[PDB]
């Protein structure tokens with residue numbers, strides 16, 4: 079229930095959108111306009127270096143907002159972020175991939191074209 | 192109920208496969224392992240020379256195992272087999288076609304490339 | 305009949321970790337070269353499992369009435385057959401059908417009845433003077449019994465009644481389940497040379513007997529056997545000896561398991577789906 | 592079960608015809624790719640092509656199969 | 671939006687900046703080398 | 715009424731079984747009843763074994 | 765080989781899914797149609813039979829649609845391969861970065 | 864019946880998206896050929912570029 083910036087006419091109780099979903103309801107306690115947004119977004123994904131290469135994995139959340147790196151394609155945990163760029167093999171989305179390099183651990187970086 | 196060559200652990204009665212179908216049941220008579228295979232396979236088919244050319248036909252079964260010629264693509268009856276090869280017109284399968292040649296009857300042969 | 309014990313210094317129970325243990329056949333069908341996943345109560349891998357001691361050197365003897373959840377895992381690194389059997393029930397006051405699965409020196413005895421169960425039943429072994437053999441004489445498991453229906457004997461099972469203090473040489477695992485009132489037994493003897501920290505090797509459990517009882521259950525407790533040699537005065541108050549043994553009790557939870565069936569037809573691996581993200585990835589791809 | 596299937600026999604007719612069309616389309620795909628020429632040309636017995644070694648793509652008579660060593664390596668690679 | 675009912679939209683692997691970079695690289699190759707860069711090393 | 719050259723699928727072939735076997739065991743168990751006849755001695759007619 | 769392996773694995777998994785569809789009840793009280801006939805009378809068990817018919821019809825229709833789309837993709841790839849054969853194999857093609 | 868209706872709607876949407884994806888794949892193949900021919904060289908195909 080976020081703080082909205084749009085006011086209603088003084089005769090309405092609900093509020094819908096273009097997609098016809100009730101996402102705005104006036105609070106009867108103090109006539110406060112509050113927005114509605116669902117919490118569960120997307121699923122989970124697992125980054126695996128492969129068989130006979132490593133054993134540890136990295137878990138990627140699709141559209142969930144949060145070692146731990148907040149990428150543009152959700153939340154990525156279990157893979158450290160490094161500023162340099164190499165050629166990427168395991169795609170993730172939004173221009174950043176993940177790989178297993180140098181011990182050695184799973185890293186995430188912006189791909190090189 | 193064919194005679195299998197795989198032994199069962201002495202606590203099991205049923206048996207399945209990769210495709211999850213019960214195809215091996217242990218017979219409780221004297222502990223014999225017997226496989227299960229369906230007896231009905233595929234359908235029937237007909238070879239017709241066409242109109243204004245002939246009146247007889249040749250019945251072909253898709254995969255049923257048996258004048259009568261045992262082809263690779265099932266059982267073909269009503270069409271004699273000849274060792275020579277010409278260009279083929281009516282396809283049957285597995286490199287063998289059928290045609291109406293020299294009286295004259297329906298013949299089956301390996302196609303020529 | 306039964307007698308009461310005397311208060312003494314005991315040892316608190318410890319907690320240990322399982323290593324790919326508690327895997328049995330979930331059905332009675334034959335599967336070869338297929339990775340089949342089933343929903344059934346198993347023991348989760350790498351879970352903190354309870355540990356109970358049975359060694360003398362001190363005077364450790366603990367037999368709590370643990371609650372019987374939906375399936376239990378009972379593993380013992382038995383060496384000299386110190387443990388005897390198990391008892392079951394809800395209140396143990398001759399009001400319900402209490403089980404008694406014991407293994408005497410001549411034959412296994414399974415009889416669920418309404419035995420007048422005491423506070424701490426046990427098996428007593430006495431060392432004869434003229435005879436150099438350990439023989440069981442104190443058969444104090446219950447006070448009396450009234451009525452029951454089921455009784456099973458099976459084939460005779462021979463065990464050794466002599467207790468030692470050396471290292472263990474065998475490992476026995478048991479799984480007890482109750483689905484729709486049907487009692488399930490899964491066991492397999494496995495040789496090993498270790499004292500603790502159960503190996504990471506894999507071994508499935510095959511059913512032995514499948515009891516159609518259909519009764520009520522919620523609690524369980526194990527039975528132990530102590531020795532009465534010439535060193536101890538022979539009274540069950542403060543002086544006794546129990547040899548050396550250790551049994552593990554684990555509780556089964558409903559998790560999907562991906563089994564590895566080889567070309568022979570036995571389970572080889574039991575990769576999970578709710579333990580590790582890598583295991584979930586393995587079991588979602590069925591590979 | 593068959594008695595209630597007369598109410599949906601047309602659906603099974605469409606499904607069977609679609610599968611037959613798919614099968615004959617798969618059959619016609621091989622004729623459009625490999626049957627480009629209507630004359631089978633034999634490889635000459637002379638293997639002196641100015642130094643170009645063609646044994647890895649031409650069939651070899653050492654094996655009963657007509658596949659090339661590249662094709663035999665290709666057949667076993669896929670399942 | 672269209673995401674409130676579980677209809678999540680997957681972001682593309684390549685952003686618009688990377689596509690623009692690819693187009694600029696192709697443009698530079700086709701004005702500075704012609705077709706040599708498309709069939710081998712780039713020749714001035 | 716006119717059929718051209720080619721393959722045609724008309725119907726299906728099903729091999730209907732003609733015999734059925736439903737025997738579950740190889741033999742059933744017994745109970746001790748031969749001692750009624752295989753006995754050292756029998757009873758009389760005024761007081762017979764039941 | 766990636767291209768040659770997908771066309772076999774997809775068909776095999778579609779066949780496996782078709783087999784798996786017969787293990788579901790589609791909201792009925794049983795999966796196998798023989799069990800309901802043996803345990804219930806045909807006048808009463810007609811609705812369960814019809815529900816199973818509708819479920820199997822839906823699964824078969826989805827399989828047919830998937831196979832038709834796969835066949836269209838295979839037809840496009842076969843046309844591309846035939847053109848590649850007739851251009852790069854049966855002669856020399858002037859199209860740059862095509863062969 | 865709600866399950867069946869939602870399943871039917873989802874299946875129809877998936878079929879429409881698959882057909883659209885096939886058309887997009889054909890268009891992308893055409894665009895790739897155009898990029899390889901008209902851009903990465905000079906194409907002798909008349910009325911193609």
Ligand SMILES: *[C@@H]1O[C@H](CO)[C@@H](O[C@@H]2O[C@H](CO)[C@@H](O)[C@H](O)[C@H]2NC(C)=O)[C@H](O)[C@H]1NC(C)=O
Nearest residue numbers: 638639640642643644645646647648651653660
């Ligand atoms: C063409 O290449 C093949 C490679 O397969 C050559 O065959 C090899 O020849 C060497 C030299 O004697 C042998 O040691 C290898 O065992 C051969 N391999 C096979 C698979 O046959 C062949 O000699 C070459 N021919 C020409 C004319 O260059």
Ligand SMILES: *[C@@H]1O[C@H](CO)[C@@H](O)[C@H](O)[C@H]1NC(C)=O
Nearest residue numbers: 141142143144148149150152
């Ligand atoms: C994620 O949440 C944190 C704290 O709740 C917030 O500071 C951050 O702006 C959020 N990220 C986005 C993209 O809104």
Ligand SMILES: *[C@@H]1O[C@H](CO)[C@@H](O)[C@H](O)[C@H]1NC(C)=O
Nearest residue numbers: 158159160161162163187188
């Ligand atoms: C490298 O990454 C760190 C991470 O915060 C950043 O502060 C730094 O500016 C980066 N350096 C370069 C050259 O990108």
Ligand SMILES: *[C@@H]1O[C@H](CO)[C@@H](O)[C@H](O)[C@H]1NC(C)=O
Nearest residue numbers: 219220221222739740741742
């Ligand atoms: C078949 O029956 C006989 C009794 O006539 C029995 O002895 C034998 O063990 C049986 N065979 C089995 C159970 O395999």
Ligand SMILES: *[C@@H]1O[C@H](CO)[C@@H](O)[C@H](O)[C@H]1NC(C)=O
Nearest residue numbers: 254255256257261262263265
């Ligand atoms: C067909 O059946 C005959 C006799 O039943 C048998 O000899 C033959 O091997 C069978 N063919 C095949 C391909 O199994």
Ligand SMILES: *[C@@H]1O[C@H](CO)[C@@H](O)[C@H](O)[C@H]1NC(C)=O
Nearest residue numbers: 260271272273274275276299
């Ligand atoms: C065809 O000719 C070959 C020549 O050896 C012979 O072996 C074969 O039996 C002949 N087939 C028929 C059907 O005459």
Ligand SMILES: *[C@@H]1O[C@H](CO)[C@@H](O)[C@H](O)[C@H]1NC(C)=O
Nearest residue numbers: 319320321350351352353354
């Ligand atoms: C040991 O067991 C307890 C209770 O089951 C649990 O809370 C604890 O996390 C376990 N220890 C470890 C290291 O997981």
Ligand SMILES: *[C@@H]1O[C@H](CO)[C@@H](O)[C@H](O)[C@H]1NC(C)=O
Nearest residue numbers: 406407408409410411412413
């Ligand atoms: C062993 O105990 C059982 C009861 O559990 C009893 O029936 C049997 O007679 C005992 N054996 C001996 C040798 O006393």
Ligand SMILES: *[C@@H]1O[C@H](CO)[C@@H](O)[C@H](O)[C@H]1NC(C)=O
Nearest residue numbers: 398399418450451452453454
């Ligand atoms: C045994 O006796 C009790 C009476 O205390 C009775 O409630 C119970 O039903 C009896 N059990 C059987 C199997 O008859």
Ligand SMILES: *[C@@H]1O[C@H](CO)[C@@H](O)[C@H](O)[C@H]1NC(C)=O
Nearest residue numbers: 394400401518519520521522
């Ligand atoms: C079995 O026990 C449960 C509670 O544990 C009780 O609700 C149920 O009525 C009992 N059933 C019988 C047959 O005693």
Ligand SMILES: *[C@@H]1O[C@H](CO)[C@@H](O)[C@H](O)[C@H]1NC(C)=O
Nearest residue numbers: 196197198566567568569570
């Ligand atoms: C299982 O059977 C196969 C085939 O007989 C054999 O090769 C394999 O060794 C057997 N496995 C075991 C553990 O005996």
Ligand SMILES: *[C@@H]1O[C@H](CO)[C@@H](O)[C@H](O)[C@H]1NC(C)=O
Nearest residue numbers: 746747748749750751752753
């Ligand atoms: C009685 O004994 C005879 C011989 O000992 C034996 O053949 C027979 O089967 C037994 N039983 C009956 C019912 O006659």
